[PDB]
Design a protein around this ligand. Structure first.
Ligand SMILES: [Cl-]
Length: 292
């Protein structure tokens, strides 16, 4: 059975006058592995993956601002707010060189950072990552009406903020196997208070879809141009049928991205971590092996 426990001792660091939570496990005598979650997860999404990596590499898994066990400041929780706090989280921890393990909005933060800091990235493992969605036709059919409603200051806030539909609906529906009530309760925890749900609603409004928002669309094209031209070692997890990365997209990228390996996880949607953690773990560990 896939583990439901989050046993990890808390760590805290002051970043821009707020306290951010993170997991820190593993030896301090090598290159650290920075795991970045997306919406609407936390470090909890990495709980069954980090045990495969910890024995050889230090594993750092922050909760983005507003999320997991990090403070809940009074921000709009824009993408740019996340960039500011994650930039400072890495400097706050004195990291020089890192390997990145990134997903969804974590892949936006990771690829934006890697583009700005090429010389400090020794590898990127990624899955179900943000690329520009030129029209709604490129967004999956089944997700199309949901996300169109989310992108309204009236209907979106009713669903996500008042009813918490991102947690109760969107989240478990991004997983092929059924999440257990214990799993749901971990993902529920940060967001028991409705006013604390602002980041859950902002992010979908920040997705780069049919040219808007303009600024995110530009930011994401730039890190894609960089990713396409970087020689950095790359490891892409994909599943069938996926959501943000269909199999066809994965195969093209496997072939075109320099120095990139692809690992089919099997049946998979958005949260690949919840469907085959053991393989994601062991492939990351084995891929770290040979970066030496
Ligand atoms: Cl989102």
């Amino acid at each position: 059975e896939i583990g439901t426990g989050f046993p990890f001792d808390p760590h805290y660091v002051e970043v821009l006058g707020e306290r951010m939570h993170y997991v820190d496990v593993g030896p301090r005598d090598g290159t650290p592995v920075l795991f970045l979650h997306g919406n609407p997860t936390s470090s909890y999404v990495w709980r069954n993956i980090i045990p495969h990596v910890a024995p050889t590499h230090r594993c750092i898994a922050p909760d983005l601002i507003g999320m997991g066990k990090s403070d809940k400041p009074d921000l709009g929780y824009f993408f740019d707010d996340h960039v500011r706090f994650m930039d400072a989280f890495i400097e706050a921890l004195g990291l020089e060189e890192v390997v990145l393990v990134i997903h969804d909005w974590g892949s936006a933060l990771g690829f934006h950072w890697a583009k700005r800091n090429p010389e400090r990235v020794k590898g990127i493992a990624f899955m179900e990552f943000i690329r520009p969605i030129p029209t709604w036709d490129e967004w999956p059919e089944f997700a199309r009406e949901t996300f169109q409603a989310f992108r309204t200051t009236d209907v979106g806030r009713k669903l996500i903020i008042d009813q918490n539909v991102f947690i109760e609906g969107t989240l478990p529906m991004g997983v092929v196997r059924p999440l257990t009530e214990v799993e749901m309760d971990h993902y529920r925890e940060p967001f028991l208070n409705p006013v604390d749900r602002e980041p859950l609603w902002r992010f979908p409004n920040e997705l780069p879809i049919a040219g808007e928002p303009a600024n995110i669309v530009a930011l994401v094209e730039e890190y894609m141009d960089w990713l396409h031209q970087s020689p950095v070692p790359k490891l892409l997890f994909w599943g069938t049928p996926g959501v943000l990365i269909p199999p066809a997209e994965a195969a093209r990228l496997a072939k075109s991205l320099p120095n990139c390996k692809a690992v089919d996880i099997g049946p998979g949607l958005n949260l690949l971590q919840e469907d085959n953690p053991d393989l994601i773990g062991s492939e990351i560990a084995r891929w770290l092996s040979t970066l030496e």
